[PDB]
Amino acid sequence: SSSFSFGGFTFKRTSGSSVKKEEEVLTGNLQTLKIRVNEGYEEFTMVGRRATAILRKATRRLIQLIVSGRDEQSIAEAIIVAMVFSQEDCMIKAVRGDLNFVNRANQRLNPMHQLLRHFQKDAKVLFQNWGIESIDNVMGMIGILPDMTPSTEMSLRGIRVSKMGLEVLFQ
Ligand SMILES: O=C(O)[C@H]1[C@H]2CC[C@H](CC2)[C@@H]1Nc1nc(-c2c[nH]c3ncc(F)cc23)ncc1F
Ligand SMILES: O=C(O)[C@H]1[C@H]2CC[C@H](CC2)[C@@H]1Nc1nc(-c2c[nH]c3ncc(F)cc23)ncc1F
């Protein structure tokens, strides 16, 4: 509808709709989180200083992320935000230790920001447990492995790196 900020990226919804439904989820540390799950199919653009992306998602499901970034670190930053934003069970179950993050005032962060801060600290467990898949047509986009190196054979599930800037899909 209108643009919002998450993880250093401006997001804008380009199509679709969702409704919030409260769900209780267990983390990989058996901590209960109360998350307002977005239910529906939606498409987004993401813009950051060093990466842009197209995000297509459904209820707790990253269907596809196409990322264009300056370097491996910048691409990884966009992927992490997209994986948290997806609200996938896979991402919740990749949490290690308990989440009790607070802001500058002593106020507990909301669960989505708990998750974001967690995986922005270290995404290695998230990347290693997300899943990989074989990729075929590499003419327009290539794969990225859990170690953030390129591949023309495999990729993180639903993740592709564009061989071009993304104005063509933003238009
Ligand atoms: O425009 C904004 O509000 C923000 C949001 C969207 C992208 C940046 C980070 C978040 C942006 N802020 C700024 N970007 C930039 C900027 C430099 N090179 C870039 N390349 C791509 C890009 F996209 C933004 C930038 N410079 C100063 C900024 F202040
Ligand atoms: O839901 C919220 O509390 C906030 C915080 C956590 C993620 C977004 C940015 C901060 C969120 N804000 C917004 N989310 C959404 C939104 C649509 N579909 C989604 N699927 C998963 C998700 F996670 C957030 C969304 N749209 C507009 C927003 F403005």
DSSP string, 54-77: EEEEETTEEEEEEEEESSHHHHHH
2: which residues sit within 8 A by CB, 6+ positions away?
12
Ligand 1 atom 28, closest CA? 49
CB-CB contact of 77 with 51 (8 Å): yes
- Tracing tokens 């995986």 back to the chain, one arrives at 119
Q: Which ligand is nearest to the CA of 113?
A: 2
Residue 84 is given by DSSP the state H
End-to-end CA distance of the chain: 16
The span from the CA of 131 to the CA of 5, in Å, is 27
CB atoms within 10 A of CB 53: 28
CA 102 – CA 112 distance, rounded (Å): 13
Ligand nearest to the CA of 63: 2
Residue from 120, 82, 99, 136 nearest 25 by CA: 99
Taking the centre of ligand 1 as the mean of its atom positions, its distance from the CA of residue 134, in whole angstroms, is 34
Q: How many angstroms is it from 86 CA to the middle of ligand 2?
A: 10
Which residue owns the Cα nearest ligand 2 atom 5?
A: 112
Give the closest ligand to the alpha carbon of residue 8.
1
CB of 10 within 8 A of CB of 3?
yes
Residue of 169, 149, 168 lying closest to 159 (CA atoms): 149
Quick one: which atom of ligand 1 is closest to the CA of 52?
A: 23
Q: What is the spatial distance between Cα 92 and Cα 94, in angstroms, rounded to a whole number?
A: 5
Distance 3 CA to ligand 2 centre (A): 11
d(CA 100, CA 2): 30
| Residues with Cβ within 8 Å of residue 15, at least 6 apart in sequence | 42, 43
Nearest to 95 by CA among 81, 74, 116, 64: 116
Alpha helices in the chain (DSSP H): 72-85, 89-93, 111-121, 124-130, 167-170
Q: CB-based contacts of 55: which residues, under 8 Å, 6+ apart?
A: 11, 43, 44, 45, 46, 62, 64, 65, 82, 85
Output the six-digit token pair for 120.
């922005």
State the distance from the centre of ligand 1 to the C-alpha of 49, rounded, in angstroms.
5
Distance of CA 126 from the midpoint of ligand 2 (Å): 20
